[PDB]
Write a protein that binds this ligand. Sequence first.
Ligand code: PHE
Ligand code: PHE
Lengths: 231, 232
Amino acid sequence: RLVQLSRHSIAFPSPEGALREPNGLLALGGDLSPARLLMAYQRGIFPWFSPGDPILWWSPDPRAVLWPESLHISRSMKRFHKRSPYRVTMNYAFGQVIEGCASDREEGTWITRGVVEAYHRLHELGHAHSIEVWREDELVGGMYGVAQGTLFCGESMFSRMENASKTALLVFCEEFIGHGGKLIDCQVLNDHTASLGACEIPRRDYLNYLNQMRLGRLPNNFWVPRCLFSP
Amino acid sequence: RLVQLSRHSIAFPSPEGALREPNGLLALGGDLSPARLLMAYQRGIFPWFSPGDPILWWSPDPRAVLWPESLHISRSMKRFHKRSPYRVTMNYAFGQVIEGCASDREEGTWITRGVVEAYHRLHELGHAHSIEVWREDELVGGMYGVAQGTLFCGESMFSRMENASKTALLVFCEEFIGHGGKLIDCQVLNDHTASLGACEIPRRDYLNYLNQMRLGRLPNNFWVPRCLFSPQ
Ligand SMILES: N[C@@H](Cc1ccccc1)C(=O)O
Ligand SMILES: N[C@@H](Cc1ccccc1)C(=O)O
């Protein structure tokens, strides 16, 4: 079933044809052009591969996801955030945020220069966005992802100061569900993500939700760079 | 006559007071801030000036216009589109379409970094939209403009491959007609646009439509990013 793409076409096979093991392996090759990525996210597919490997495309089953309103903020964290030392912005510094996610040296190692450029382009073309957590004047955390209507595909988050991540995920969610936001894609469920409320659902249901929310919208100025949380 | 705009205000003078030669010259100055720009379109005035010159605002008489249903499509173009090698999307890459137009060099030359940013702001705010034409993984054509209700002001189009721009306009028009679209402003008629079916009407006539149509309303999600036409 595994299909190998080419520059000749930006078309992906159907998600349903993905492999079980590894879970979701749908295709390889192609490029990371704005067009190909938009076509991919539009069909519930996303790129993920380690450096040195050809571009690998996925559509796992089940699919990890997170309902905004179902975010789990610990008792200790609400106390922390009630007196948060951070300020949160939107699309003020996409480059630093994804560089942050790339830096750490864990699941962000896949984010190579090539990946960085590709998503930075999407951010400029207006589809990939970032939330920035600030401590004083320095960036200590944040997250970025690709928007798909009222749906948000979370690519990655990073932190250089205690509770910076959660702060972004926390505030983004309030801002998100307050303006029509309906869903966040986590791709594959892990520990940190689970501890935040991420829950699995069937791929078919995810795709069902996907082309249901991609044609929706949020306020015109929702992604306009601005301040999301400042005491 | 004529009029210098002020950073202070954001108001414009009556289009009817514009010059005859050069046809449309109404005012000069101000800036390209979202507000002033948007107000200009409301009033049937648009900015146009060569790099180096001060901002120039226009409202020509007659005004070039294109009734969507009257878009002329040659028989060989129909043949081609039927087996089209192109993909058409909406608001996938506004920045590239405008940059694509700012390179047409016949006269996309007026489109400076200043103009690109100005229209890019309108796009960020949801007033300026783009229609892209893709050949495989390459952007080979498109068009962008400012939405005015059910009226649509075409700013420019570009083409890097045979019939690329004609399919953009063809696919757009279908989409546009389908959901209430009523008229496309073409500003000043030119050989190409005229062959696609564009025509001239009086400025007072155009303004009339503009006022009626700016109140119009397209589906709530008409402009969200999406594919409009997938090749075969
Ligand atoms: N794959 C990402 C999904 C995600 C990114 C950003 C915000 C929320 C979720 C993760 O595991 O963190
Ligand atoms: N002023 C434009 C009008 C137009 C642009 C794009 C699409 C349709 C019409 C031109 O002739 O370049």
